[PDB]
């Protein structure tokens, strides 16, 4: 449905930001 995508767009956007941030920080941590 489109209602579940446009009512929780802020938590989903935050989840994407934290996911890519954690991925990049964990990638640089092993250098």
């Amino acid at each position: 449905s489109i209602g579940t995508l446009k009512r929780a767009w802020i938590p989903l956007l935050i989840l994407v930001v934290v996911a890519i941030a954690g991925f990049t920080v964990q990638r640089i941590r092993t250098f």
């Binding site: 802020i10 956007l13 935050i14 930001v17 941030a21 990049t24 920080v25 640089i28 941590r29």
Partner: protein, 739 residues
């Protein structure tokens, strides 16, 4: 109606005041001070997984010389060439030094043996040195008392006439640096306290309001100090001297920002024309969530600082996070309570001569009507700041950032008068192979390694078993009958391993070994050794390199990776908290871009002032502390300004800009000037590092407060208009109402 939390804090104000006072008293009486618990619970500054530390531990283990990297040197010089009295003094002194065991473990006796005496003596003969390897890692307390013990052992006896003695080395440097930082906190503190009091009398124009605001800051500082000391004393968390220094400076920063925020909002609310109770309730409802969000995002950024790979930053995040939680709790409960009790005690907090507000509304009216050209001017000043940023160098030698009156510095000066090299900071290279090294052809291979290391551009001396003096410039041969002379056996125990499976070379650089070139030399040293062992039966060995420059190259690599990690974490947390606060992705993007541009321009301006005009390079701790403190404070003021801007938009966007500026920019710039000049008055310090850090933070935050936050963010906001709040649908102006 009325919210519940401010009513609860307001009604029960004096029990909260008394309880906070009792808790502060208990934590500052039954628990010792932060400097002492930092001293007794210090940590090493190098990683355990760093190749330099592993190499130094391995060198200590193979040659059976301890498990420590700390070392110092004893230097003897005379106005005449040294004679037999110097020999007798040297033998007696190394005897009493080898008597001590619990402080000193190893002593490289080179001047005693006549073979290596020419390698341990000056060209003119008026200087000599010996290296002693002490107990405890660098940055710990144990190395400090080992340095004190060895220097009082040396000073306990009277040298022969005409011959003088000094202590030198990196351990002596760090011990004297700790002593200097201990004893250089009186007169700079005097000028700091007087500039704080004159700045508060300038900002507030009263002696009472300044007194309450100082009470707020000092109570928050004592509460934070006591809480962190309690959590560190009972071994729950870890502490460091660097951690306590950064903790106290960031605690003063956050406390004075929050105190100025609360007091300024209350005074503006009373200046609007309402009575003293709804003024308190509206200042609470206005800035309480602002303080809460700002403090939690700084706490989150400082906690994400703990996910790194450098001991200067791993040991700092949890103390900063906990301390910031106490700061937020104090500014949220003790702050409004004492504002309320001094409000209802009588006539204490009064608005008088409100002229900053009208001037900042004039500035807002200027930035609204012409956003374009003012934005061009602000970006022109930013590009003035940015163009000197690509040219920027660093120095790692800490001798030229200290006063010259330290005993380590005069020992260095005595060493430099007779030695043309940096002989006080050597490097050790070990090669470890899987067979016995007492053989003639293998000795030829060792001479090949020494010659190959010697040919690196910048390496002045290499000391090996083959050529002890440091001139491997001849063809070498060695008949095998030399293994019977006991003096050559002493040399063999001095240089080779006791089991004969490792060889070490002692390498002395040229000029400054802690400069950028000195950092770059050691990779070429390791590469030259690696192509020196190729093709021999020794091919496939383990090459270990230890010393000061190896440690500093490791620290610089970790510094750049750690800067990237902490930058990404901090900017992501800033984006997140702006996304909650505004419900706008474009405003968050604008704010993050403004923050990163402002940081770059400010650090470029500081580099221009220090490296180009004054002529001395910057440190690297200065970059680290500057970016941390400026990131935290900039997030705080940007969040308050954007929240005040969001608070009133319904009556237009341009009117929103002018009203938000006149209601918040004065408070933001008052806090900015107060903290900027407080950090600026550290420039009179005879310690160069802390002067650099203080004035870098001061001029960077002055540039942040005066140009970027006052003329660039409102210009971008008014230029983008109603596309500053996408995805939300907002009008540029409301419906035109009749007159």
């Amino acid at each position: 109606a009325r919210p519940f939390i401010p009513r609860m804090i307001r009604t029960f104000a004096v029990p909260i005041i008394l309880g906070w006072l009792v808790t502060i008293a208990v934590l500052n009486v039954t628990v010792p001070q932060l400097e002492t618990v930092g001293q007794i619970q210090a940590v090493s500054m190098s990683p355990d997984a760093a190749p330099s530390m592993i190499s130094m531990k391995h060198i200590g283990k193979v040659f059976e010389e301890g498990d420590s990297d700390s070392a110092a040197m004893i230097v003897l010089e005379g106005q005449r060439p040294l004679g037999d009295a110097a020999h007798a003094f040297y033998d007696q002194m190394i005897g009493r030094l080898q008597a001590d065991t619990t402080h000193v473990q190893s002593l490289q006796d080179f001047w005693g043996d006549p073979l290596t005496a020419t390698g341990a003596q000056s060209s003119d003969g008026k200087a000599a040195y010996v290296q002693v390897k002490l107990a405890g890692n660098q940055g710990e307390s144990l190395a400090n008392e080992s340095v004190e013990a060895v220097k009082t052992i040396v000073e306990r006896l009277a040298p022969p006439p005409g011959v003088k003695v000094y202590v030198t080395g990196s351990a002596a440097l760090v011990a004297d640096q700790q002593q200097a930082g201990d004893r250089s906190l009186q007169v700079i503190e005097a000028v700091t306290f007087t500039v704080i009091i004159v700045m508060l009398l300038l900002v507030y124009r009263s002696i009472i309001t300044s007194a309450i605001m100082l009470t707020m800051v000092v109570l928050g500082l004592l509460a934070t100090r006591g809480g962190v000391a309690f959590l560190g004393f009972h071994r729950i968390i870890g502490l460091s001297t660097f951690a306590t220094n950064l903790l106290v400076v960031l605690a003063i920063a956050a406390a004075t920002d929050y105190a100025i925020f609360l007091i300024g909002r209350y005074q503006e609310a009373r200046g609007l024309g309402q009575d003293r109770e709804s003024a308190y309730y509206t200042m609470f409802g206005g800035t309480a969530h602002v303080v809460l969000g700002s403090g939690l995002t700084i706490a989150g950024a400082t906690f994400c600082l703990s996910f790194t790979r450098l001991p200067y930053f791993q040991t700092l995040g949890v103390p900063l996070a906990i301390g910031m939680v106490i700061v937020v709790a104090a500014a949220l409960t003790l702050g409004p309570a004492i504002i309320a009790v001094t409000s209802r005690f009588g006539k204490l907090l009064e608005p008088k001569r409100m002229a900053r507000v009208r001037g900042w509304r004039k500035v807002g009216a200027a930035i609204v009507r012409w956003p374009g050209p003012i934005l061009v001017g602000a970006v022109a000043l930013a590009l003035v700041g940015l163009l000197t940023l690509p040219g920027y160098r660093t120095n790692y030698n800490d001798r030229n950032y200290l006063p010259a009156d330290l005993p380590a510095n005069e020992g260095y000066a005595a060493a430099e008068r007779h030695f043309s090299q940096a002989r006080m900071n050597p490097e050790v290279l070990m090669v470890e192979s899987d067979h016995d090294m007492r053989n003639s052809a293998d000795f030829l291979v060792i001479n090949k390694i020494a010659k190959a290391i010697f040919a690196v551009e910048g390496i002045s001396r290499v000391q090996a078993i083959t050529r002890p003096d440091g001139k491997p410039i001849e063809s070498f041969y060695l008949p095998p009958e030399v293994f019977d002379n006991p003096d050559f056996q002493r040399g063999l125990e001095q240089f080779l391993s006791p089991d004969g499976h490792a060889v070490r070379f002692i390498i002395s650089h040229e000029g400054d070994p802690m400069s950028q070139a000195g950092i770059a030399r050691i990779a070429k040293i390791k590469t030259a050794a690696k192509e020196a062992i190729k093709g021999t039966p020794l091919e496939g060995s383990a090459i270990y390199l230890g010393g000061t420059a190896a440690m500093f190259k490791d620290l610089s690599d970790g510094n750049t990776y750690d800067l990237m990690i902490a930058g990404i974490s901090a900017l992501c947390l800033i984006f997140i908290i702006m996304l909650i606060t505004t419900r706008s992705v474009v405003a968050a993007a604008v704010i993050v871009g403004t923050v990163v541009l402002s940081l770059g321009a400010s650090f470029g301006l500081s580099v221009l002032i220090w490296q180009h005009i004054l002529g001395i390079e910057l440190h690297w701790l200065v970059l680290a502390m500057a970016v941390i403190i400026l990131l935290a404070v900039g997030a705080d003021y940007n969040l308050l300004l954007v929240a005040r801007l969001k608070e009133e938009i319904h009556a237009g966007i341009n009117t929103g800009i002018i009203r938000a500026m006149g209601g918040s920019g004065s408070v933001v710039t008052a806090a900015g000037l107060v903290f900027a000049f407080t950090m600026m008055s550290f420039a009179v310090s005879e310690l160069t590092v802390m002067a650099q850090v203080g004035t870098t933070i001061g001029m960077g935050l002055l540039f942040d407060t005066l140009i970027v936050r006052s003329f660039m963010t409102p210009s971008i906001a008014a230029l983008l208009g109603k596309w500053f709040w996408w995805p939300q649908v907002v009008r540029q102006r409301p419906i035109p109402q009749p007159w």
